[PDB]
């Protein structure tokens with residue numbers, strides 16, 4: 001039943017997922033004046049050159065672009081991380097208007113949307129084992145602002161038509177996620193959680209400083225997707241973001 005509506009929204013998740021009120025919930029507001037540079041942070045290694053995308057799926061709250069994670073084809077290493085983390089999927093969160101949609105905020109600023117590249121710690125063997133551990137997952141988060149089109153995104157935008165409703169999927173091979181990165185890999189990092197139920201506290205968040213630009217036309221096509229299944233009454237897929245959660249006992253570090 002969970003979702004983003006008035007009766008099943010984030011305000012309600014704690015009832016079925018008590019960890020929602022936990023000590024290391026995501027997302028959070030990034031107070032730039034309180035984040036601290038950490039010169040001990042090693043440089044971030046994004047190695048997506050052999051990434052193998054497979055499929056795109058409308059899961060009822062967003063769409064996932066899924067990848068083959070049977071081997072070390074696309075990985076995240078270095079930065080705050082120990083070991084190797086394999087890309088399993090990416091998705092977005094976006095708003096009903098350009099003034100909202102991101103999950104993380106920067107000095108309370110909300111971007112139009114946010115891209116999450118989800119990776120799991122290969123020493124745990126699979127994703128399911130990984131989300132039983134405090135260092136199981138690493139998510140690369142990238143803000144989207146509305147401006148010029150992102151060429152690298154257009155392929156995704158153009159398949160949306162075919163996965164309009166919940167549980168629809170389409171073939172999605174040969175997509176290169178490198179085309180969704182900004183120039184700079186400067187980041188902020190903190191320990192957190194999934195921002196969707198079950199809200200497991202297993203994530204090392206790495207949030208890039210530099211947003212990517214996407215066109216209004218591109219984001220408009222995101223807002224034409226549906227939460228609902230086929231034949232059901234249309235509920236447009238918008239505002240599928242969880243607001244900022246309390247930082248509690250956590251420090252956000254800057255790589256720059």
Ligand SMILES: NS(=O)(=O)c1cc2c(cc1Cl)N[C@@H](C(Cl)Cl)NS2(=O)=O
Pocket residue numbers: 059064091116117118137139193194195196203
């Ligand atoms: N939003 S997020 O990046 O915290 C996130 C979302 C999903 C995750 C994992 C993470 Cl870390 N897993 C999936 C399962 Cl369907 Cl494989 N659901 S999700 O909401 O896309």
Ligand SMILES: [Zn+2]
Pocket residue numbers: 059060061062
């Ligand atoms: Zn869902």
Ligand SMILES: [Zn+2]
Pocket residue numbers: 091092093116195
């Ligand atoms: Zn997400």
